[PDB]
Amino acid sequence: TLDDHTISFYYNWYGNPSVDGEMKHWMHPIALAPGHSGDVGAISGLNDDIACNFYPELGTYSSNDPEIIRKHIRMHIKANVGVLSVTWWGESDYGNQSVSLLLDEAAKVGAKVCFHIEPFNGRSPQTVRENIQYIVDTYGDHPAFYRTHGKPLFFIYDSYLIKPAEWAKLFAAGGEISVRNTKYDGLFIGLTLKESELPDIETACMDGFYTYFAATGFTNASTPANWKSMQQWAKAHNKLFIPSVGPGYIDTRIRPWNGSTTRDRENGKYYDDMYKAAIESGASYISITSFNEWHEGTQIEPAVSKKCDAFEYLDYKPLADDYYLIRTAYWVDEFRKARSA
Numbered sequence: 001t002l003d004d005h006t007i008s009f010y011y012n013w014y015g016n017p018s019v020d021g022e023m024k025h026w027m028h029p030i031a032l033a034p035g036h037s038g039d040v041g042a043i044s045g046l047n048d049d050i051a052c053n054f055y056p057e058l059g060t061y062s063s064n065d066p067e068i069i070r071k072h073i074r075m076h077i078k079a080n081v082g083v084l085s086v087t088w089w090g091e092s093d094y095g096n097q098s099v100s101l102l103l104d105e106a107a108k109v110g111a112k113v114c115f116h117i118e119p120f121n122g123r124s125p126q127t128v129r130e131n132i133q134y135i136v137d138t139y140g141d142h143p144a145f146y147r148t149h150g151k152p153l154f155f156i157y158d159s160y161l162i163k164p165a166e167w168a169k170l171f172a173a174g175g176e177i178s179v180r181n182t183k184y185d186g187l188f189i190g191l192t193l194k195e196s197e198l199p200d201i202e203t204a205c206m207d208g209f210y211t212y213f214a215a216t217g218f219t220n221a222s223t224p225a226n227w228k229s230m231q232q233w234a235k236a237h238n239k240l241f242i243p244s245v246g247p248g249y250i251d252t253r254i255r256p257w258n259g260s261t262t263r264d265r266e267n268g269k270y271y272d273d274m275y276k277a278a279i280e281s282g283a284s285y286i287s288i289t290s291f292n293e294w295h296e297g298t299q300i301e302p303a304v305s306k307k308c309d310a311f312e313y314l315d316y317k318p319l320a321d322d323y324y325l326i327r328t329a330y331w332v333d334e335f336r337k338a339r340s341a
Contacts, residue, residue, distance in 0.1 A: 002082040002110060003332045004148065005284060005339070007242070008291040008300070009116060009212075010072075010084040012063040012098040019062035026050045026060040028295060033257035043253060048308035052294035053250045055306035055313040057321050063098045066105075072291070072301075073105040079300065079328035081288065083112045083146050085155055090120030090131055094138075103144040112146035113139070116155045125162065125170040129177055132184050140183075148285075152186035155210055155242075155287070159190035160200065167204035175205070189242055194220035198233050208239045214246020214289040214298040215261045216274065224277035231281045243278040246289040247271035247324050250297030250314065262297075267319060268327055275331040279338050286335060288328065300324035 015024025023044070028051030030041030043051040050060060061068045076084060084106065086099060093099070103113050115135055117128060136152065139145050146153060159167070169175045171188055179185050190201055192209040201209045209230075213222035220226060227243050234241035248265035251258055263270055278286045292301040297314070302321040306313045316323050 001080050002077065003080055003336060004082040004112065006081045006286050006288065006332050006335065007083040007085050007114065007153075008076065008079075008081050008288045009244075009293065010086045010102075010291045011293055012086055012096070012102065013089075014061055014063045014292075014294075016060050016062045019065050023060065024062075025295070026052075028254055030253075031255050036257075047310065048306065049310035050294075051254055053253050053297045053314050054294065054299065054303040055315070056292075056294065056299075057302035057304050064101070066101055069098065069101045069105050073102075073109055073111055075301065075322075075325055076111055076291070077109055078322065079325045080332035081291075081328060082110070083114060084291065085114045085116040085153075085287070087118055088115045088131065088135070089118050090123065090127065092120070094134055099139065103139060103142045107142065107144035111144060113142075113144050114146040114153045114155070116157060119158050119161065123162070125166050125177060128156070129170055129179060129184070132179060132186075136184050136186075148187070153189065154186060155189045155191075156206075157191055157212065159204070159206075160193060160197070164200045164203035167206065171205035173205075187240065189240065192221045192230075195226050195230055195233070196220070198230070198237075201239055202237055206239070208234065208242060210242040210287055211244045212287075212289055213249075214244065214274075214296070215249035215263045216270075218249075218261055224274055224281075227277055227281035227283070231283050234283075240285060241281070241283050242285045242287050243281060243283050244287045244289045245271070245274045245278045246298040247274075247300055247327075248297060251295055253311070254295045265316070268323060271324065271327060272331075275334075279331070279335050284339070300328055 013025045027045030032038045173180045187207040189208045189210050190206045211221040217223045231241045249263040290298045292299045305315045
């Protein structure tokens with residue numbers, strides 16, 4: 001049942017007054033349109049007025065709540081998703097409570113955890129190295145630490161912001177700060193924006209590439225029509241292609257100007273079409289954007305009908321709160337059957 005080649009994008013950034021002493025992330029700024037002046041708005045996270053277009057079954061939960069973490073792991077078991085890639089924000093995340101709990105809870109059910117390296121302040125080949133060292137030293141011995149073909153896997157969000165020649169210092173065998181053939185080696189997966197920039201993956205000496213964005217066509221790389229061709233490139237260049245599939249997209253609470261990126265779920269049709277494209281590409285690994293990026297409306301996490309004075313939330317009606325967990329399990333089984341064939 002439980003698939004070790006299916007990886008959800010997991011966010012551990014949520015906090016509440018009960019567990020953390022303040023709202024975290026459920027309270028969120030409202031972003032200005034690109035190139036525009038203005039004051040930055042705020043959604044308080046209070047009075048059920050929260051920074052997302054859907055409303056969680058688990059409410060304004062804390063990522064540091066062991067009961068929530070237990071429930072999230074159980075939801076992955078329901079979805080047959082065996083791997084979570086947790087958002088990682090650099091030094092500020094050293095020793096953070098949620099990661100240890102996630103590992104502990106994953107280990108009880110045979111789930112695994114890998115890391116999604118985010119664009120933290122001062123990110124560079126050197127500080128990425130330091131973070132890999134921290135992650136491997138602190139979590140690498142954990143029974144639930146993910147390895148595939150014997151190697152840890154790291155996704156690197158917006159990696160293209162650091163030049164390939166700089167990455168090569170870290171990822172080339174001869175690189176000046178190389179992790180290759182050290183205890184810090186693994187599979188490093190860069191975010192690609194377009195098929196035509198795939199050579200940058202090779203120049204950077206990365207092991208593969210992923211697409212992240214759940215909204216079809218937001219980038220060339222997140223356009224499913226291009227997935228067969230990208231897989232072909234990956235195979236020809238000894239790289240791992242990891243498409244990212246999502247159930248929809250909407251982020252207009254946090255980005256009111258961003259309606260062009262909205263993708264309706266159409267009672268699961270959007271997810272079906274995208275997941276089928278990912279399987280049909282021939283990729284060996286599939287990533288899911290997202291388990292719980294609530295701000296961007298990409299979550300497969302159960303959502304409920306909800307209204308407050310300030311907002312009426314979207315929801316999954318007339319389908320079950322857990323529809324997207326159920327439907328994920330279906331697609332994971334289709335994926336396993338395709339890979340077996």
